[PDB]
A paper describes a structure:
Neurexophilins are a family of secreted, neuropeptide‐like glycoproteins originally discovered as α‐neurexin ligands and later found to bind to the LNS2 domain of α‐neurexins (Petrenko et al, 1996; Missler et al, 1998; in the following we often refer to α‐neurexins simply as neurexins or Nrxns). Our data reveal a unique, extensive, neurexophilin–neurexin binding interface that extends the jelly‐roll β‐sandwich of LNS2 of neurexin‐1 into neurexophilin‐1.
In the structure of the Nxph1‐LNS2SS2A+ complex, the 384‐HAM‐386 sequence of SS2A extends the N‐terminal part of LNS2 β9. The other part of the SS2A sequence (379‐HSGIG‐383) forms a disordered, solvent‐exposed loop as suggested by corresponding weak electron density. Difference density maps calculated by subtracting the observed structure factor amplitudes of the Nxph1‐LNS2SS2− structure from those of the Nxph1‐LNS2SS2A+ structure showed strong positive electron density throughout the region near SS2A. Strong positive difference peaks revealed the extension of the β9 384‐HAM‐386 part of the SS2A insert sequence in the Nxph1‐LNS2SS2A+ structure. Furthermore, the M386 and H384 residues of SS2A extend across β10 of LNS2 to interact with H125 on β1 of Nxph1. Indeed, Nxph1 binds to Nrxn1 LNS2SS2A+ with ~6‐fold higher affinity than for Nrxn1 LNS2SS2−. For example, the Nxph1‐LNS2SS2A+ interface contains the same key I401 residue found interdigitating with Nxph1 at the Nxph1‐LNS2SS2− interface.
Residue numbers in the entry:
A (entry chain A): 280 to 378, 383 to 386, 394 to 484
B (entry chain B): 119 to 180, 189 to 214, 217 to 261
Write the structure that this text describes.
């Protein structure tokens, strides 16, 4: 079944990427979230040039990413509403450096934005730094992170994939892996946030 | 400049926005940035050049340090107004814009800022293609 976890503000997953560093020309991140809180970090990967930061900021989905030689930031929100309405919301972020040509896509529920541009020079996506889900250490300097709150809510089917591997982070947390470490204790379901 | 042929699409069932951007180096210490965008549906869109310090935020609002300025802008908007038949006003807007920015070359770290306010979703995004330069 679905891999879910409830974060209460003092918990987060930490997947170690040092031994098996990820490197690819494209990657993709998907997850579903449910929350009542206006601010909180949902995931961050990359303590280096490249990184992806996905958070709730004042009830809006905030995305901050490095894209090769460039940077990209988006803020997404329903009209006459917020995403912290205690309902599931689906997020997908794709990054591509195939030709050089840079391309970023983000969808939240019924809005999709695809942005790109020709870029001659070209690097790699990924990092050897940890993968944080639902929060991060208080003393961690996470680039491109506009929020400092840990997440309070439910995260479902958090997945990272590139051209080489597909990491099912929520499932790995629920089941266990030598590279997956959990700060604190979380129930692997979606508890009544209300 | 480290980039060219910018393109962006922002899509909901209520509004579709298509943007292209092109850079022309005039070889005289100045360069132009041209944007064209077309939108069909309901809502407001905008594309502009901004400095990297521009805060990404929602905003109901529509020089000396920043050395890019608009020199020409042309906007054509066509509105079809009909009675909603889920409840007899529904409208469809078709917008086509062209904007010419002129930038002075002693500085080049420039960002593209896009805002999208429809009837179901809103979105702001800042793209800095050569930020790491």
């Amino acid at each position: 079944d679905a891999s879910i976890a409830t974060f209460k503000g003092s918990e987060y997953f930490c997947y170690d990427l040092s031994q098996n560093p990820i490197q690819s020309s494209s990657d993709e991140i998907t997850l579903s979230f449910k929350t009542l809180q206006r601010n909180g970090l949902m995931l961050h990967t990359g303590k280096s040039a490249d990184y992806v930061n996905l958070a709730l900021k004042n009830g809006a989905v905030s995305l901050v990413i490095n894209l090769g030689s460039g940077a990209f930031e988006a803020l997404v929100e329903p009209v006459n509403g917020k995403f912290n309405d205690n309902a599931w919301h689906d997020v997908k972020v794709t990054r591509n450096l195939r030709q050089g040509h840079a391309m970023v896509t983000i969808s939240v529920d019924g809005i999709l934005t695809t942005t790109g541009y020709t870029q001659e020079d070209y690097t790699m996506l990924g990092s050897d730094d940890f993968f944080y889900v639902g929060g991060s250490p208080s003393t961690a300097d996470l680039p491109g992170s506009p929020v400092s709150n840990n997440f309070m809510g439910c995260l479902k089917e958090v997945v990272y994939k590139n051209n080489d591997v597909r990491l099912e982070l929520s499932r790995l947390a629920k089941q266990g892996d030598p590279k997956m470490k959990i700060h604190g204790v979380v129930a692997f379901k979606c508890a009544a946030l209300e | 400049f480290g980039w060219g042929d910018f393109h962006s699409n922002i899509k909901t069932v209520k509004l579709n926005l298509l943007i292209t951007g092109k850079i022309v180096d005039h070889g005289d210490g100045t360069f132009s940035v041209y944007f064209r965008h077309d939108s069909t549906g309901q809502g407001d869109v905008s594309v502009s050049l901004v400095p990297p310090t521009k805060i990404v935020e929602f905003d109901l609002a529509q020089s000396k340090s920043f050395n890019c300025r608009i020199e020409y802008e042309k906007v054509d908007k066509a509105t079809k107004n009909t009675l909603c038949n889920y409840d007899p006003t529904c409208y469809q807007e078709q917008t086509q814009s062209h904007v010419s920015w002129l930038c002075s070359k002693p500085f080049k770290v420039i960002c593209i800022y896009i805002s999208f306010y429809s009837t179901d979703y809103k979105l702001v995004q800042k793209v800095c293609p050569d930020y790491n330069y």
